[PDB]
Amino acid sequence: HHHSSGLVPRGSHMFLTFPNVAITRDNRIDKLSENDLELIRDTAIQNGGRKIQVQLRDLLYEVSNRAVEGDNNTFKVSFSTTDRAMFRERHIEWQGNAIRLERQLNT
């Protein structure tokens, strides 16, 4: 970066970034910590069913609570992009990681 190492980008609850996310030998996310999952859950809850963004390694995931009516503590994971090159190149791991994140959020 063209800025001092004593300065970092200001964060937002709209965009959560998890730096040291463990990777599995099959090129997938491992189990996130309980504190990480609770932070994602609480942030999605505070946004009342509207999507928040979650950065795991170098990919972006969209997460919302209110996945189903009746239970607000149900979480949905999706992803979206415009650049065809990144989708063409990463869609398989992106989808698999999205499944895993959803599974961890609801277990």
Residue numbers in the entry: 9 to 115
What does the paper say about this structure?
Here, we show that the Salmonella Typhi STY1076/t1865 protein, named StoD, a homologue of the enteropathogenic Escherichia coli/enterohemorrhagic E. coli/Citrobacter rodentium NleG, is a T3SS effector. The StoD C terminus (StoD-C) is a U-box E3 ubiquitin ligase, capable of autoubiquitination in the presence of multiple E2s. NleG effectors share a conserved C-terminal U-box E3 ubiquitin ligase domain that engages with host ubiquitination machinery and have highly variable N-terminal regions presumed to be involved in substrate recognition. We suggest that StoD recognizes and ubiquitinates pre-ubiquitinated targets, thus subverting intracellular signaling by functioning as an E4 enzyme.
Therefore, residues 1–101 of the domain were expressed with an N-terminal tag in E. coli, purified to homogeneity and crystallised as native and selenomethionine derivatives. The 2.5 Å resolution crystal structure of StoD-N was subsequently determined by anomalous dispersion. The last six amino acids of the domain are disordered and not included in the structure. StoD-N crystallised as a tetramer; however, inter-subunit contacts are predominantly formed by the N-terminal tag, suggesting this is not a physiologically relevant oligomer. Indeed, size exclusion chromatography with in-line multiangle light scattering (SEC-MALS) of untagged StoD, StoD-N, and StoD-C showed that both the full-length protein and individual domains are monomeric in solution up to 16 mg/ml. Despite two loop regions having higher B-factors, the four subunits of the crystallographic tetramer superimpose with an average root mean square deviation (RMSD) of 0.34 Å, indicating StoD-N has a relatively rigid structure. StoD-N has a globular α/β sandwich fold, comprising two α-helices packed against a twisted four-stranded β-sheet, with one parallel and two antiparallel β-strand interactions. Second, ubiquitin has structural homology with StoD-N, which is again made structurally distinct by the additional C-terminal helix. Therefore, StoD-N can be defined as a new ubiquitin-like (Ubl) domain, which is striking in the context of the role of the full-length protein as an E3 ligase, which uses ubiquitin as a substrate. In both cases, these localize to a defined surface, which for StoD-N comprises the N-terminal parallel β-strands and first α-helix within the ubiquitin-like fold.
